[model samples]
Target: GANKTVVVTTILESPYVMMKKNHEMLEGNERYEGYCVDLAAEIAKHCGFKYKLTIVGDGKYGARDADTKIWNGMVGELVYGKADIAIAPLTITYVREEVIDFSKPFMSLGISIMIKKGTPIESAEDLSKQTEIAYGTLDSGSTKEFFRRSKIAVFDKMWTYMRSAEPSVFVRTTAEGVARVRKSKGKYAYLLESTMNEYIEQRKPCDTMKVGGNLDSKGYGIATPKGSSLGNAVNLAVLKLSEQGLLDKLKNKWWYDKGECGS
Candidate 1:
């Protein structure tokens, strides 16, 4: 039984997927490296398949169009039959799960608070009730959508203010949101995934800190179109990696081994 080469879809998020410094000298998957790259290799090795990593066009994690009923980003790639799998930091959310098959979370994460060091904020509640300190999430992302869909009093209230905040609190990129936090002189806070917040906390300068427990828990999973043939094997591989402790090993390999801040 000859199988076709798998087309793996992903994105270029730092530490997850990134271009090699000498990428120009290389070709194909050789030009990229990171946690996701290594994981892709291991997944292929364990599954006994060949794959070609393809960065998703439009640079999104996948979101449904409110009016068109269409999908976008890597998820769209799979849904449209353009990709065999997606191995990226795409959050496994309720809405997405309805349209795709997700391998049991390859990585767990939660929505958390990020603030400049010495900021008065200590938790989501602190940010939720305040007016002086402006906080927001990445524009057009799962985080922002979470707030929009929440029914809880505080979250609803927070979304109200965020949606109407003067000067627009939402940022286009996590990097942009982080930059705002660092440059706002305590006036702004950024809401982001816990894993990413932890990574930034240990990076150069150490000027920022994660201020609260996660607002909610979720995960990143290997996604395939609904009923994809690859779905079954990817799930087993993720579980095997987790049980064998290889998942933890890889987490430390890419995240802490190269960390700059003192422990």
Candidate 2:
């Protein structure tokens, strides 16, 4: 009761962030769950800071508004001084880094294209060159921007197509993009993270496969507003977890190979 607690802002994303059945029964770090949750716990312990998990009020965790040149969600939290720390899958982008200090990358991933099996398209490059198979992504998000900013062959090629394509292929969210692929038959493909694609393949209405390796390397990092004292401690905690093989253990616990007990 006497401890000073830091408010950590997070968003609800699939296996990464979600409410447990009896989340109210848990408290403090115990109330926090998922990959970001695990990472946050390690960092907090190392820094000896008391913390609490407070889900961001807005559904969209972080986003850029072109018209006003502003950010929302956790980005908003930091800018407005609502929270002292933010531990989420917030991407480290140049625009964001300029305003917020980011810890070293804790996780690395790439944008990938997901399609229903048996689609005529074989790879991202094929979708890039052709006009027949339409593809899209979660709008106003990193995945779309990844393609938009790519310099490589197919992704760069696809960016040119999307920028000029009629009807604008960006979906409002990741779920919407997946639904478009699920119901579009072979005409549409969903471009998202390889992890999300793999997660969906295990479910019913299962008709998708992640095709093509990730187009490029990008990473998620712990974020704090400029001049945050927590930045150095958080970064070191991530490296410690990595070195101790704890991060690997947590990934396996949440992702693949949950083991027979989880099964």
Candidate 3:
């Protein structure tokens, strides 16, 4: 544990972990760039460790197998002793928390509404009142699950319409949902997490916006095997980073300094 090279598990998602343009010529952690990549280095540095970054093989973010009771993503990697740390945008879910350790949230997020620029929707409530602008979530993800299990009347009704829509409004990915929103010319709105919503808002063409306060809140956290010595120092490091405002500066650097859209 003193000098061992920690295996860092992450997922390849935009802005969290992205392949660099010259990735073919790069090596080690140099091969990647983005928010989580930056944070990984910070975590390793401040916590006094050496590490290697590897994206998860199955790329599923660890879901429980209802039948077999196994996990399959970075979480699975941790549970199976394949990695020493997980530092991507893995959502902090209690379902897996019992088995692994989650650092104090590195980023807090909520489900958000995304719409084409100039789309006549300002909120989920607005979308709820109109059928002309059909809206939906990434098929059966956190947001979809939120709507389905929602206690709020407005979101519950929104779920009702989505499940019964004639043309099937659900999308399979944020990329697909964002594409659907852009191509539909305001005829479609997408429900996704606020993180991706804001990331897209700052991307090229600048054709989308996140509307309304998010419907629900959650967090992304650094993870490791439960009760590992790494847990306390990491939670402390994250707290120190937040207290020193380094994380805020880092967030601005990744999300805005690299942003391709308008000022």
Candidate 4:
């Protein structure tokens, strides 16, 4: 019997999903490339299935609305049966776990702060204690959600300020948050996944730094709809790849091999 072609939902974050330098001349999956693309290829090879990669049309990782109570973005697609798998940099969280299943973590990371090179903020603690500088997270990601629901005293206080900050601190995307940090000239700091913070720090301009250690530890996972048969195979495949050191190799390839930051 022929295996079904899986529809893999992903996002367009740099180093995870991006176009090649010559992407305009490419076609189909060839038109795009990145760490997730490579991982998807490996998973397909190991699982013996063909797949069609599609970017999440809404350009979000997935967030559930409080009022409408509807899921939106990649998570929504999977929740509503629009995509068979989510192979992007989606975080594994208890809220999401209830609606979908995740393979074992493919990469472990935590939330961190992005600040302009001369920002006085040294840590989450520093940011939480003062009001001279404004800080925020990517508007709809787990990092932002974490702060919103945190019981930790420092994070809770920070969320209180951000939730009602006069000028609106939330950003529609990581790039927007990063841009705010750059343009604010040390007046703004962006909280996001440490992996992305580090990746951007190594890029050009070199004016942004990932300040402080991650606030909490977690990991990114390959998500699938609940009860999907692809769950077991994908989980095993990730474990096998991790054991073989491919995961580290992929990280080095995307994040450090061509990194602009000098040691």
List TM-score per model, in order.
0.96, 0.86, 0.89, 0.97
Q: Give residue 75's error in model 2 in angstroms.
A: 2.0
How many residue pairs clash in each candidate at the backbone level? 0, 0, 0, 0
Q: Top model by lDDT, which number?
A: 4
lDDT of 1 by residue, 64-83 (tens): 88999899888899999999
Give per-residue lDDT, candidate 3, residue 136.
Answer: 90
Candidate 2 residue 234 C-alpha distance from true site, Å: 0.5
Pick by TM-score: which candidate is best? 4
What is the TM-score of candidate 1? 0.96
Local accuracy by lDDT, each model: 0.90, 0.78, 0.87, 0.92
Model 3 lDDT at residue 161 = 97
- Residue-wise lDDT of candidate 2 within 1-263, one digit each (tens)? 56578999887776677677787897755655687787777889888987888788875657778799777888888878998888887778887888899888877777787887788876787897788778987765677777767777777788888877778777766678788888887889888877667766655566877887877677888899899887888888888888898987877767766422224
User: Where does candidate 1 stray beyond 4 Å?
Assistant: none
Candidate 3 steric clashes? 0
Q: What is the lDDT of residue 166 in candidate 3?
A: 75
Q: What TM-score would you give candidate 3 relative to the actual structure? A: 0.89
Worst 10 residues of 4 by lDDT: 19-28
Tens digit of lDDT per residue, candidate 3, span 1-263?
25899999998777899899899999989999999999998988899998999988976577667699987778889999999999987778767688999999999899899999999999899988989999998652457667877889899989999989979898765788899999999999999888889999999888999988988789988999988889999899999998999889888888888799967
Candidate 2 off by > 4 Å: 1-3, 23-32, 151-157, 163-168, 259-263
Candidate structures ordered by TM-score, highest first: 4, 1, 3, 2
Q: Indicate whether candidate 1 or candidate 2 has the larger TM-score.
A: 1
